[PDB]
Symmetry: C3
Subunit: 195 residues, 3 copies
């Protein structure tokens, strides 16, 4: 079997990786690293708490989640950006020009959600890279599906990506997990190789 010491080594390693933003890959969409949403180029924000703000009011500290939230690591319940319906988009200016190799999408865990369901989670999505900074023909880097039955954090690797580099990428949500009124995005990450 294993020694008590080998267990400790294993646990140490697992916690080291846990503390490296869970997945151990640099995130070029991270706002604190220098990334930003191009607000001009995102879906309109939807307020998911209209029912509570209508019945009890609008707190003096309250503000709607803006697209910036998808580049922020706090993913406690409600710290997600929502748009109306099952299709939406956000364009991100990365902190550096990179050759993109993967993205990560995460949603609140079922265990922290009412009735253990996350129907507002994104489902099918696609990633586009914008060479010039202009609402041009974005070029598809890949198409994926966030699995509502999978782990909260899911990483998607592009299949045979170009050597092409980008500093602007679009997250395009095409379907959601069935919520008939909105979709919300807890955090979006972009990984790749810089210069």
């Amino acid at each position: 079997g294993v020694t008590e010491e080998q267990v400790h080594h294993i646990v140490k390693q697992a916690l080291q990786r846990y503390s490296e933003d869970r997945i151990g890959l640099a995130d070029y969409a991270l706002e604190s690293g220098g990334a930003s949403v191009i607000s001009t180029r995102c879906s309109e924000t939807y307020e998911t708490k209209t029912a509570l703000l209508s019945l009890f009011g609008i707190p003096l500290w309250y503000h709607s989640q803006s697209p910036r939230v998808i580049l922020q690591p706090d993913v406690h319940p409600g710290n997600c950006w929502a748009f109306q319906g099952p299709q939406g988009f956000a364009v991100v200016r990365l902190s550096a020009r990179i050759r993109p190799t993967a993205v990560t999408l995460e949603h609140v865990p079922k265990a922290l959600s009412p009735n253990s369901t996350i129907s507002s989670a994104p489902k099918d999505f696609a990633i586009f890279g914008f060479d010039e900074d202009l609402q041009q023909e974005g070029t598809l880097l890949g198409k994926f599906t966030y699995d509502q039955d999978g782990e909260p954090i899911q990483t998607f690797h592009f299949q045979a990506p170009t050597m092409a580099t980008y500093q602007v990428v679009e997250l395009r949500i095409l379907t959601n997990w069935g919520h008939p009124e909105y979709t919300c995005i807890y955090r979006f990450r972009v990984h790749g190789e810089p210069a």
Copy 2:
């Protein structure tokens, strides 16, 4: 014994649970989820840093912790709401109407506290549910004691709770762990079943 692979499975599971807000239960008192303190119905806030703000001054960024802090997940030392003396209360409007089944109270760990003592931690407390939204006769859901010798995060299950639902609950602190001047509350959670 156990295989190295079984150790890895165990560690993975433990970290998965760790990342689900430590205890894996939805929190209906979580401010980001839509909950709020009814400021009208809380004890007066006590400033625990009067000695430091009197000798060195009031920073241009400094503000007193308000009751909202008990619905916020940052529990680093000092990120607690304090009231004067050993008895106090806070009333919370939950993010949803639920049948309440448990609460969670947590305090800073002894190891992060001066001299490994947490005398300002709450001790005896009670939980009341308010059916109508009016400072009425709250109805006692349960009485418990936060153990200063226990784990920092402690969860308390109601014994034979009604099927009755509430969206307003009061945390009533009745004793503290001996601090002669105030009690402070790092985080309060409410669990249960919604609709």
Copy 3:
């Protein structure tokens, strides 16, 4: 070998320690605990994102990291205070008068950094204690080196420290890991024994 139950005990203990600010020692430099930078007595702040703020602009929410950041626990990439060149300093008023026994310095992990390099990390540094509150002769508590090949969080114990107590200490950076333009500090902690 070990039992599956003993593995669980080990994992529980490791996670308990992980949750105690990783290292299980009280931090008297922690801003939320009552500590503060003496802004009058820090190096001038350097903006590391001048290239991005010049090409894309200055966001309506954007602000430069100030020395306060080294007393704040968020250490995601970019949540560090930078100064120009490889030598710099910051003076901290601790939350309590203590006999200092150790300090902790941490930097972003290589795995979250472009090209797995952290050349702006501090290298050689020294810690001074200031008895009177006046830019006096600080008295050297110890000299250390942050290892860029070590763990992200590194703790340094003073060798034969006095029984002397202080509430003001200076972190003096003397070298960095080779970045020719600035050094940045993610988080600085001070440990010791109070009254």
